[PDB]
Amino acid sequence: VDTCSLASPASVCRTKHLHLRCSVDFTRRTLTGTAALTVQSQEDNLRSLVLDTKDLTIEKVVINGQEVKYALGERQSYKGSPMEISLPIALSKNQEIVIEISFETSPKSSALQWLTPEQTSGKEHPYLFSQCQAIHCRAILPCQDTPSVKLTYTAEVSVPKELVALMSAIRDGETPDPEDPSRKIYKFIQKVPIPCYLIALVVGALESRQIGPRTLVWSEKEQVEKSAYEFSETESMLKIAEDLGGPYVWGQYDLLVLPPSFPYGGMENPCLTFVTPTLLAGDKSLSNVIAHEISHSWTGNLVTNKTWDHFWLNEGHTVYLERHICGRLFGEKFRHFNALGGWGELQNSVKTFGETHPFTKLVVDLTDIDPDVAYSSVPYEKGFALLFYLEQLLGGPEIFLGFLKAYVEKFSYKSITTDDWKDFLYSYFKDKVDVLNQVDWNAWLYSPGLPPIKPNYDMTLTNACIALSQRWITAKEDDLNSFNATDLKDLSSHQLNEFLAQTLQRAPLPLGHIKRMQEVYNFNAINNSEIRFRWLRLCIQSKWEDAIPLALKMATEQGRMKFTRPLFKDLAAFDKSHDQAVRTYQEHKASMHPVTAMLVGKDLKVD
Ligand SMILES: CN(C)c1ccc(C(=O)NCCCCCCC(=O)NO)cc1
Ligand SMILES: [Yb+3]
Ligand SMILES: [Zn+2]
C-alpha cells in the first residue's frame, strides 16, 4: 500500500489505459477535457472505486453511455481529494470497463506552471509545462496516482494553432482542430506501460532540431542552436546505456529544453526528457544530467519503485548506471572522481538535515509527508554508495553490471520494493551469500546518517582539487599574493566545480580570501550554473555584500530548485541580505512554479 495515494490500490483494480482528449486554454489557465480510463477489476463483485484528484472540477462521469454517480471527499492537503465512483454494474475479477471523466484543472494545479509571454524567451507567446513526479499527476487528471500501477496512453491535445504540444509519448500527427480553425490538435501514443508520474505535457512556441537518429531537441527558437551543441553526446550515451541495460524499448528519445523556471535539472518523461536550460554551459560539461535521464529508461521507467518509500531504487540505480556511462565515455578514473564527489554531496545532506533525521535513511516512511518537502540527495547518493560498495564487495564493476542487466530484465514492466531488489540480489549472487551476509542491511537501509562503510575511491583526478582548496583554506593574509590565474590552468570545469565544492564544505572563509579569489580567478564571469551556484554560496556564507545582487539574480532568473532554494536560504541567513531575500521572494512568488514557490516559502519561514 502506497501511503501517498488515496485511490483504490492495485489489489482492487488497475488502470490499463488512458485516452486523454483535452484543450489548453491560456486565458482561463485550465486544461479541460475527458480522461477515459480502461480499468481492470482485480476483485469479485467490484461496485465502486476511488481515484486521486487535486483541485479538479469534475463535470461528469460516464460509463457505457450514461452518467454515473460520484463523490469527492474532503481535501487531504497535498494528497488532494479522493473521488469515489459508483459503477453501474458490478465487475467480476479481470473484467475491464472504460470510465470517461470530464474535468477541468485549476489555474493553481500543482503539476502545472503557466507562463506569460514575458516569462518566455520569445516574448510573443505564452507557455505551459507539467511536472508530475512524484504525486502531481492527480492535479492534471483523475487517476490512481501511484507508481504501483502502469498504463499505456493515447492523447489528443487541442492548442492555439500558433503553438506546439508535446508529451511523454510518440508524436502521431497534427491536424487543424475540426471544432475550431484557430486551433490545432496534436496526437500522441505511449505503447509501453508507464506509471502515471511519467505523464507529461508542454505547450509553447517550440521548434525542433535533429541531433541523433532517434533524438530531436525541442525548445523555443532562442535556445535551439546552443541546445543541439550542448547535448550532441546523447546518441553515444544511449548506445552505451543499451550495452549496459539491454534494449532501449521506448523508440524515440527526444529532449525538451524548458524555460528557466523548470524546477529540476532533468525529468525522465518517457520519449521526451525535460531539462533545465541551466545545463547550457557552452562546453557540454553538464551533460551527465542527460546520461542520468537516459539511464531512467531502464532504472525507473522500466523497473519502477512500488511506492515513493522505495525511491532510492529508481534514483540510486540511475546514478549508478549514469556514472558507468560517464566512465565508458571518459575513463574509470572519471567514474571514481564523480563517485567521490557524490560521497561529498551525501556528507553535505546529512549535515544539513542532521545525522539522526529520518530523511537521511535510505528507505523512508512517507506517511503524512509531502514527498517535495522531504526530497534531497540522500536516495541518490546513499543509494549509489550502497551499490558501489556492493560492486567492490562482489568482485567489481563488470560482475556487478551483469547483476544490473539481469535485475532490469527480471523486473521490466513491474513495480517493486526494496525487498524485491534484495531478494533478487541474493538470488543472483547465491554463490556469494557469505559475503552478502557481512553487509549491515539494517543500518544501510533503515538507519539515519552516513552509511556504516565508505567504499574505496580512486583519488587521481580529485587530488588537484583538494590541493588547491587546502591551499586557500590554510592560507593566511600574507599568502594571498601567491594565488594567480595559473592555479586553474590544468583544472577541467568539473575539477573547478569540485575545488569549489571542497572549499564550500569549509565555508565561511575570510572575506579577504573571497575577495582575492574573485581578483585572481574572476569567478563572477563564469556561466557554468553549477560552478556559479557554489561560488555564490561561498561568497554569501563568507559575508561578502557585493555578492548579494548576484545571488539574488541567480535565485530569480532561474528556478531550478537545486540552486534557487539554497541561494534564498543562504541569503536569508545573511543579516545584510535577509530582508531583500524575503521581499524578493514575496515579489516573485505569484510568478514562480507552484512547488518551488511553496518550498522556498517554508525555507524562508514566510507566510
Ligand atoms: C523518498 N522521498 C522523500 C521522495 C521520493 C520522491 C520524490 C520525487 O519523486 N520528487 C520529484 C523528482 C523529480 C526529478 C528530480 C531529478 C531527477 O532525479 N531526475 O531524473 C521526492 C521525495
Ligand atoms: Yb462474482
Ligand atoms: Zn532521477
PDB file of C-alpha atoms in Angstrom, residues 247-495:
ATOM      1  CA  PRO A 247      17.387  -2.882 -25.390  1.00  0.00           C
ATOM      2  CA  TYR A 248      16.039   0.724 -25.334  1.00  0.00           C
ATOM      3  CA  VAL A 249      12.315  -0.139 -25.528  1.00  0.00           C
ATOM      4  CA  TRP A 250      10.782   3.352 -25.964  1.00  0.00           C
ATOM      5  CA  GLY A 251      11.521   4.126 -29.651  1.00  0.00           C
ATOM      6  CA  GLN A 252      12.267   7.837 -29.527  1.00  0.00           C
ATOM      7  CA  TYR A 253      14.469   9.742 -27.108  1.00  0.00           C
ATOM      8  CA  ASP A 254      13.799  13.430 -27.539  1.00  0.00           C
ATOM      9  CA  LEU A 255      14.922  16.272 -25.399  1.00  0.00           C
ATOM     10  CA  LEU A 256      12.999  19.332 -24.397  1.00  0.00           C
ATOM     11  CA  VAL A 257      14.860  22.324 -23.012  1.00  0.00           C
ATOM     12  CA  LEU A 258      12.417  24.267 -20.903  1.00  0.00           C
ATOM     13  CA  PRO A 259      12.256  27.855 -19.796  1.00  0.00           C
ATOM     14  CA  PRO A 260      14.342  28.875 -16.832  1.00  0.00           C
ATOM     15  CA  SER A 261      11.725  28.145 -14.157  1.00  0.00           C
ATOM     16  CA  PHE A 262      11.692  24.426 -14.692  1.00  0.00           C
ATOM     17  CA  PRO A 263      12.215  23.081 -11.166  1.00  0.00           C
ATOM     18  CA  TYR A 264      14.625  20.200 -11.780  1.00  0.00           C
ATOM     19  CA  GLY A 265      17.901  19.516 -13.661  1.00  0.00           C
ATOM     20  CA  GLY A 266      16.069  16.898 -15.637  1.00  0.00           C
ATOM     21  CA  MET A 267      12.932  14.777 -15.644  1.00  0.00           C
ATOM     22  CA  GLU A 268      12.921  11.397 -17.417  1.00  0.00           C
ATOM     23  CA  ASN A 269       9.495  11.626 -19.102  1.00  0.00           C
ATOM     24  CA  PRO A 270       9.440   8.737 -21.498  1.00  0.00           C
ATOM     25  CA  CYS A 271      10.300   9.586 -25.090  1.00  0.00           C
ATOM     26  CA  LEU A 272      10.788  13.212 -24.058  1.00  0.00           C
ATOM     27  CA  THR A 273      13.281  14.048 -21.346  1.00  0.00           C
ATOM     28  CA  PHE A 274      12.661  17.573 -19.943  1.00  0.00           C
ATOM     29  CA  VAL A 275      15.760  19.538 -18.970  1.00  0.00           C
ATOM     30  CA  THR A 276      16.658  22.850 -17.319  1.00  0.00           C
ATOM     31  CA  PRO A 277      18.253  25.494 -19.581  1.00  0.00           C
ATOM     32  CA  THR A 278      20.841  25.885 -16.829  1.00  0.00           C
ATOM     33  CA  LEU A 279      22.559  22.883 -18.457  1.00  0.00           C
ATOM     34  CA  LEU A 280      23.650  25.269 -21.273  1.00  0.00           C
ATOM     35  CA  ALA A 281      27.278  25.860 -20.167  1.00  0.00           C
ATOM     36  CA  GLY A 282      28.781  26.109 -23.666  1.00  0.00           C
ATOM     37  CA  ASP A 283      31.103  23.121 -23.305  1.00  0.00           C
ATOM     38  CA  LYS A 284      28.925  20.010 -22.615  1.00  0.00           C
ATOM     39  CA  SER A 285      30.328  19.777 -19.049  1.00  0.00           C
ATOM     40  CA  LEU A 286      26.793  19.319 -17.507  1.00  0.00           C
ATOM     41  CA  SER A 287      25.685  16.537 -19.849  1.00  0.00           C
ATOM     42  CA  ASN A 288      25.890  13.974 -17.018  1.00  0.00           C
ATOM     43  CA  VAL A 289      22.276  15.131 -16.310  1.00  0.00           C
ATOM     44  CA  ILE A 290      21.446  13.724 -19.763  1.00  0.00           C
ATOM     45  CA  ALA A 291      23.241  10.439 -19.048  1.00  0.00           C
ATOM     46  CA  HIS A 292      21.087  10.371 -15.836  1.00  0.00           C
ATOM     47  CA  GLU A 293      17.782  10.817 -17.588  1.00  0.00           C
ATOM     48  CA  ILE A 294      18.779   8.366 -20.297  1.00  0.00           C
ATOM     49  CA  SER A 295      19.527   5.808 -17.569  1.00  0.00           C
ATOM     50  CA  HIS A 296      15.970   6.103 -16.079  1.00  0.00           C
ATOM     51  CA  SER A 297      14.720   4.499 -19.363  1.00  0.00           C
ATOM     52  CA  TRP A 298      15.785   1.321 -17.579  1.00  0.00           C
ATOM     53  CA  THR A 299      16.068   2.108 -13.865  1.00  0.00           C
ATOM     54  CA  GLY A 300      12.729   3.787 -13.001  1.00  0.00           C
ATOM     55  CA  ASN A 301      10.746   3.808 -16.256  1.00  0.00           C
ATOM     56  CA  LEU A 302      11.103   0.009 -16.920  1.00  0.00           C
ATOM     57  CA  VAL A 303      11.710  -1.249 -13.439  1.00  0.00           C
ATOM     58  CA  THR A 304       9.747   1.130 -11.149  1.00  0.00           C
ATOM     59  CA  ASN A 305       9.585   1.846  -7.364  1.00  0.00           C
ATOM     60  CA  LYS A 306       6.361   0.369  -5.992  1.00  0.00           C
ATOM     61  CA  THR A 307       5.868   3.300  -3.585  1.00  0.00           C
ATOM     62  CA  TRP A 308       7.838   6.523  -3.027  1.00  0.00           C
ATOM     63  CA  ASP A 309       9.229   4.972   0.146  1.00  0.00           C
ATOM     64  CA  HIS A 310      11.478   2.954  -2.248  1.00  0.00           C
ATOM     65  CA  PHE A 311      12.573   5.984  -4.385  1.00  0.00           C
ATOM     66  CA  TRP A 312      16.177   5.031  -3.847  1.00  0.00           C
ATOM     67  CA  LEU A 313      15.626   2.076  -6.159  1.00  0.00           C
ATOM     68  CA  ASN A 314      14.848   4.498  -9.013  1.00  0.00           C
ATOM     69  CA  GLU A 315      17.492   7.124  -8.215  1.00  0.00           C
ATOM     70  CA  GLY A 316      20.400   5.150  -6.774  1.00  0.00           C
ATOM     71  CA  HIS A 317      20.480   2.686  -9.592  1.00  0.00           C
ATOM     72  CA  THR A 318      20.189   5.536 -12.145  1.00  0.00           C
ATOM     73  CA  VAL A 319      23.122   7.388 -10.620  1.00  0.00           C
ATOM     74  CA  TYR A 320      24.984   4.066 -10.661  1.00  0.00           C
ATOM     75  CA  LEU A 321      24.165   3.491 -14.319  1.00  0.00           C
ATOM     76  CA  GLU A 322      24.972   7.062 -15.362  1.00  0.00           C
ATOM     77  CA  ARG A 323      28.341   7.038 -13.626  1.00  0.00           C
ATOM     78  CA  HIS A 324      29.082   3.936 -15.745  1.00  0.00           C
ATOM     79  CA  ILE A 325      28.071   5.800 -18.901  1.00  0.00           C
ATOM     80  CA  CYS A 326      30.466   8.610 -17.878  1.00  0.00           C
ATOM     81  CA  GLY A 327      33.180   6.004 -17.144  1.00  0.00           C
ATOM     82  CA  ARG A 328      32.699   4.383 -20.523  1.00  0.00           C
ATOM     83  CA  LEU A 329      32.985   7.849 -22.234  1.00  0.00           C
ATOM     84  CA  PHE A 330      35.844   9.338 -20.312  1.00  0.00           C
ATOM     85  CA  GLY A 331      37.521   6.592 -18.251  1.00  0.00           C
ATOM     86  CA  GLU A 332      37.278   4.757 -14.988  1.00  0.00           C
ATOM     87  CA  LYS A 333      39.235   7.473 -13.163  1.00  0.00           C
ATOM     88  CA  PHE A 334      36.447   9.847 -14.107  1.00  0.00           C
ATOM     89  CA  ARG A 335      33.839   7.424 -12.817  1.00  0.00           C
ATOM     90  CA  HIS A 336      35.724   7.433  -9.470  1.00  0.00           C
ATOM     91  CA  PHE A 337      36.011  11.253  -9.456  1.00  0.00           C
ATOM     92  CA  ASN A 338      32.180  11.547  -9.861  1.00  0.00           C
ATOM     93  CA  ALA A 339      31.530   8.803  -7.304  1.00  0.00           C
ATOM     94  CA  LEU A 340      33.757  10.502  -4.723  1.00  0.00           C
ATOM     95  CA  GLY A 341      32.026  13.802  -5.335  1.00  0.00           C
ATOM     96  CA  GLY A 342      28.720  12.134  -4.794  1.00  0.00           C
ATOM     97  CA  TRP A 343      30.019  10.992  -1.350  1.00  0.00           C
ATOM     98  CA  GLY A 344      30.807  14.629  -0.563  1.00  0.00           C
ATOM     99  CA  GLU A 345      27.270  15.529  -1.502  1.00  0.00           C
ATOM    100  CA  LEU A 346      25.936  12.786   0.797  1.00  0.00           C
ATOM    101  CA  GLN A 347      28.070  14.290   3.647  1.00  0.00           C
ATOM    102  CA  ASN A 348      26.522  17.679   2.876  1.00  0.00           C
ATOM    103  CA  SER A 349      22.940  16.397   3.054  1.00  0.00           C
ATOM    104  CA  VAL A 350      23.477  14.575   6.264  1.00  0.00           C
ATOM    105  CA  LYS A 351      24.990  17.717   7.889  1.00  0.00           C
ATOM    106  CA  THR A 352      22.162  19.831   6.600  1.00  0.00           C
ATOM    107  CA  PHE A 353      19.325  17.513   7.754  1.00  0.00           C
ATOM    108  CA  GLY A 354      21.335  16.339  10.728  1.00  0.00           C
ATOM    109  CA  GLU A 355      22.701  12.896  11.386  1.00  0.00           C
ATOM    110  CA  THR A 356      19.521  11.482  13.102  1.00  0.00           C
ATOM    111  CA  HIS A 357      16.989  12.949  10.655  1.00  0.00           C
ATOM    112  CA  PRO A 358      14.593  10.274   9.373  1.00  0.00           C
ATOM    113  CA  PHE A 359      15.006  11.506   5.778  1.00  0.00           C
ATOM    114  CA  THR A 360      18.657  10.557   5.909  1.00  0.00           C
ATOM    115  CA  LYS A 361      17.514   6.927   5.849  1.00  0.00           C
ATOM    116  CA  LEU A 362      17.810   5.154   2.547  1.00  0.00           C
ATOM    117  CA  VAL A 363      14.316   3.585   2.855  1.00  0.00           C
ATOM    118  CA  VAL A 364      11.907   6.135   4.308  1.00  0.00           C
ATOM    119  CA  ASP A 365       8.356   6.323   5.682  1.00  0.00           C
ATOM    120  CA  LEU A 366       6.382   8.969   3.795  1.00  0.00           C
ATOM    121  CA  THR A 367       3.196   8.671   5.926  1.00  0.00           C
ATOM    122  CA  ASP A 368       1.813  12.182   6.235  1.00  0.00           C
ATOM    123  CA  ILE A 369       4.756  13.926   4.486  1.00  0.00           C
ATOM    124  CA  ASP A 370       4.878  15.752   1.233  1.00  0.00           C
ATOM    125  CA  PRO A 371       7.482  13.990  -0.921  1.00  0.00           C
ATOM    126  CA  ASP A 372       8.519  17.515  -2.198  1.00  0.00           C
ATOM    127  CA  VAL A 373       9.335  18.528   1.453  1.00  0.00           C
ATOM    128  CA  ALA A 374      11.449  15.547   2.067  1.00  0.00           C
ATOM    129  CA  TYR A 375      13.314  15.494  -1.306  1.00  0.00           C
ATOM    130  CA  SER A 376      17.164  15.605  -1.093  1.00  0.00           C
ATOM    131  CA  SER A 377      20.366  13.985  -2.466  1.00  0.00           C
ATOM    132  CA  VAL A 378      20.076  11.142   0.035  1.00  0.00           C
ATOM    133  CA  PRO A 379      18.264   8.457  -2.020  1.00  0.00           C
ATOM    134  CA  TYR A 380      20.615   9.307  -4.873  1.00  0.00           C
ATOM    135  CA  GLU A 381      23.986   9.211  -3.118  1.00  0.00           C
ATOM    136  CA  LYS A 382      23.335   6.833  -0.263  1.00  0.00           C
ATOM    137  CA  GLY A 383      21.654   4.677  -2.852  1.00  0.00           C
ATOM    138  CA  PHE A 384      24.605   4.858  -5.122  1.00  0.00           C
ATOM    139  CA  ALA A 385      27.081   4.255  -2.226  1.00  0.00           C
ATOM    140  CA  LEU A 386      25.327   1.014  -1.329  1.00  0.00           C
ATOM    141  CA  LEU A 387      25.593  -0.133  -4.903  1.00  0.00           C
ATOM    142  CA  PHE A 388      29.235   0.945  -5.379  1.00  0.00           C
ATOM    143  CA  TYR A 389      30.101  -0.769  -2.025  1.00  0.00           C
ATOM    144  CA  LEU A 390      28.332  -3.969  -3.193  1.00  0.00           C
ATOM    145  CA  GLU A 391      30.198  -3.663  -6.515  1.00  0.00           C
ATOM    146  CA  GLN A 392      33.511  -3.745  -4.710  1.00  0.00           C
ATOM    147  CA  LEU A 393      32.417  -6.412  -2.262  1.00  0.00           C
ATOM    148  CA  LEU A 394      31.214  -8.804  -5.056  1.00  0.00           C
ATOM    149  CA  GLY A 395      34.231  -8.601  -7.373  1.00  0.00           C
ATOM    150  CA  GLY A 396      33.932  -5.425  -9.353  1.00  0.00           C
ATOM    151  CA  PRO A 397      32.072  -3.359 -11.936  1.00  0.00           C
ATOM    152  CA  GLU A 398      31.948  -5.989 -14.714  1.00  0.00           C
ATOM    153  CA  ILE A 399      30.460  -8.569 -12.321  1.00  0.00           C
ATOM    154  CA  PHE A 400      28.019  -6.045 -10.806  1.00  0.00           C
ATOM    155  CA  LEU A 401      26.961  -4.812 -14.241  1.00  0.00           C
ATOM    156  CA  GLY A 402      25.850  -8.384 -15.050  1.00  0.00           C
ATOM    157  CA  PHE A 403      23.638  -8.171 -11.969  1.00  0.00           C
ATOM    158  CA  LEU A 404      22.256  -4.781 -13.011  1.00  0.00           C
ATOM    159  CA  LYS A 405      21.296  -6.027 -16.533  1.00  0.00           C
ATOM    160  CA  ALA A 406      19.706  -9.103 -15.076  1.00  0.00           C
ATOM    161  CA  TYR A 407      17.838  -7.070 -12.471  1.00  0.00           C
ATOM    162  CA  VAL A 408      16.385  -4.867 -15.289  1.00  0.00           C
ATOM    163  CA  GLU A 409      15.320  -7.890 -17.355  1.00  0.00           C
ATOM    164  CA  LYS A 410      13.845  -9.596 -14.355  1.00  0.00           C
ATOM    165  CA  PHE A 411      11.605  -6.664 -13.300  1.00  0.00           C
ATOM    166  CA  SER A 412      10.921  -4.942 -16.609  1.00  0.00           C
ATOM    167  CA  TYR A 413       7.385  -3.577 -16.740  1.00  0.00           C
ATOM    168  CA  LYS A 414       6.932  -4.173 -12.973  1.00  0.00           C
ATOM    169  CA  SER A 415       6.890  -2.065  -9.859  1.00  0.00           C
ATOM    170  CA  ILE A 416       8.950  -3.322  -6.907  1.00  0.00           C
ATOM    171  CA  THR A 417      10.097  -2.803  -3.302  1.00  0.00           C
ATOM    172  CA  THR A 418      13.483  -2.875  -1.653  1.00  0.00           C
ATOM    173  CA  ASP A 419      12.760  -6.466  -0.533  1.00  0.00           C
ATOM    174  CA  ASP A 420      12.209  -7.495  -4.186  1.00  0.00           C
ATOM    175  CA  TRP A 421      15.550  -5.975  -5.098  1.00  0.00           C
ATOM    176  CA  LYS A 422      17.392  -7.526  -2.148  1.00  0.00           C
ATOM    177  CA  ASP A 423      15.771 -10.907  -2.755  1.00  0.00           C
ATOM    178  CA  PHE A 424      16.913 -10.894  -6.336  1.00  0.00           C
ATOM    179  CA  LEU A 425      20.371  -9.697  -5.347  1.00  0.00           C
ATOM    180  CA  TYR A 426      20.805 -12.802  -3.057  1.00  0.00           C
ATOM    181  CA  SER A 427      19.431 -14.991  -5.797  1.00  0.00           C
ATOM    182  CA  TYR A 428      21.794 -13.718  -8.472  1.00  0.00           C
ATOM    183  CA  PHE A 429      24.736 -13.835  -6.067  1.00  0.00           C
ATOM    184  CA  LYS A 430      23.690 -17.229  -4.497  1.00  0.00           C
ATOM    185  CA  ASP A 431      27.353 -18.307  -4.641  1.00  0.00           C
ATOM    186  CA  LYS A 432      28.432 -15.226  -2.628  1.00  0.00           C
ATOM    187  CA  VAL A 433      25.838 -15.254   0.204  1.00  0.00           C
ATOM    188  CA  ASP A 434      28.634 -15.495   2.802  1.00  0.00           C
ATOM    189  CA  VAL A 435      29.936 -12.102   1.594  1.00  0.00           C
ATOM    190  CA  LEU A 436      26.433 -10.551   1.381  1.00  0.00           C
ATOM    191  CA  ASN A 437      25.634 -11.710   4.875  1.00  0.00           C
ATOM    192  CA  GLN A 438      28.517  -9.479   6.171  1.00  0.00           C
ATOM    193  CA  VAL A 439      26.600  -6.399   4.930  1.00  0.00           C
ATOM    194  CA  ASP A 440      24.857  -4.390   7.701  1.00  0.00           C
ATOM    195  CA  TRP A 441      21.474  -4.319   5.927  1.00  0.00           C
ATOM    196  CA  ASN A 442      19.502  -2.717   8.718  1.00  0.00           C
ATOM    197  CA  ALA A 443      21.909   0.207   9.045  1.00  0.00           C
ATOM    198  CA  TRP A 444      22.295   0.750   5.244  1.00  0.00           C
ATOM    199  CA  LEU A 445      18.580   0.539   4.525  1.00  0.00           C
ATOM    200  CA  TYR A 446      16.982   1.935   7.737  1.00  0.00           C
ATOM    201  CA  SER A 447      19.470   3.932   9.791  1.00  0.00           C
ATOM    202  CA  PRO A 448      19.910   7.675   9.558  1.00  0.00           C
ATOM    203  CA  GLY A 449      23.246   9.359   9.000  1.00  0.00           C
ATOM    204  CA  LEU A 450      26.268   8.419   6.886  1.00  0.00           C
ATOM    205  CA  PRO A 451      26.450   4.753   5.874  1.00  0.00           C
ATOM    206  CA  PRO A 452      28.314   2.322   8.097  1.00  0.00           C
ATOM    207  CA  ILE A 453      31.060   1.768   5.473  1.00  0.00           C
ATOM    208  CA  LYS A 454      32.701   4.108   2.968  1.00  0.00           C
ATOM    209  CA  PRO A 455      33.612   2.490  -0.367  1.00  0.00           C
ATOM    210  CA  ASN A 456      37.145   2.780  -1.802  1.00  0.00           C
ATOM    211  CA  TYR A 457      37.737   5.652  -4.262  1.00  0.00           C
ATOM    212  CA  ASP A 458      40.447   6.360  -6.741  1.00  0.00           C
ATOM    213  CA  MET A 459      41.858   9.806  -5.936  1.00  0.00           C
ATOM    214  CA  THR A 460      43.768  10.561  -9.219  1.00  0.00           C
ATOM    215  CA  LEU A 461      41.591  13.381 -10.593  1.00  0.00           C
ATOM    216  CA  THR A 462      40.372  14.653  -7.183  1.00  0.00           C
ATOM    217  CA  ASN A 463      43.934  15.310  -5.705  1.00  0.00           C
ATOM    218  CA  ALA A 464      44.448  18.563  -7.586  1.00  0.00           C
ATOM    219  CA  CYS A 465      41.094  19.959  -6.401  1.00  0.00           C
ATOM    220  CA  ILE A 466      41.825  19.066  -2.834  1.00  0.00           C
ATOM    221  CA  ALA A 467      45.288  20.569  -3.032  1.00  0.00           C
ATOM    222  CA  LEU A 468      44.135  23.921  -4.393  1.00  0.00           C
ATOM    223  CA  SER A 469      41.225  24.013  -1.916  1.00  0.00           C
ATOM    224  CA  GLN A 470      43.514  23.230   1.029  1.00  0.00           C
ATOM    225  CA  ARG A 471      45.902  25.985  -0.126  1.00  0.00           C
ATOM    226  CA  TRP A 472      43.078  28.570   0.128  1.00  0.00           C
ATOM    227  CA  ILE A 473      41.726  27.155   3.467  1.00  0.00           C
ATOM    228  CA  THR A 474      45.219  27.089   5.061  1.00  0.00           C
ATOM    229  CA  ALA A 475      46.324  30.401   3.549  1.00  0.00           C
ATOM    230  CA  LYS A 476      46.790  33.429   5.758  1.00  0.00           C
ATOM    231  CA  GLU A 477      46.608  37.052   4.682  1.00  0.00           C
ATOM    232  CA  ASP A 478      50.328  37.150   3.591  1.00  0.00           C
ATOM    233  CA  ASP A 479      49.853  34.024   1.390  1.00  0.00           C
ATOM    234  CA  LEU A 480      47.099  35.617  -0.686  1.00  0.00           C
ATOM    235  CA  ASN A 481      49.599  37.250  -3.058  1.00  0.00           C
ATOM    236  CA  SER A 482      50.837  33.832  -4.209  1.00  0.00           C
ATOM    237  CA  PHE A 483      47.466  32.877  -5.895  1.00  0.00           C
ATOM    238  CA  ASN A 484      47.173  33.585  -9.549  1.00  0.00           C
ATOM    239  CA  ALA A 485      45.041  32.602 -12.549  1.00  0.00           C
ATOM    240  CA  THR A 486      47.765  29.984 -13.380  1.00  0.00           C
ATOM    241  CA  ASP A 487      46.397  27.960 -10.488  1.00  0.00           C
ATOM    242  CA  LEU A 488      43.452  26.927 -12.707  1.00  0.00           C
ATOM    243  CA  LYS A 489      45.430  26.155 -15.870  1.00  0.00           C
ATOM    244  CA  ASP A 490      45.305  22.403 -15.519  1.00  0.00           C
ATOM    245  CA  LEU A 491      41.804  22.019 -13.999  1.00  0.00           C
ATOM    246  CA  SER A 492      38.789  20.889 -16.054  1.00  0.00           C
ATOM    247  CA  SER A 493      35.391  22.509 -15.491  1.00  0.00           C
ATOM    248  CA  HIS A 494      34.448  19.508 -13.301  1.00  0.00           C
ATOM    249  CA  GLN A 495      37.614  19.896 -11.248  1.00  0.00           C
TER     250      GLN A 495
END
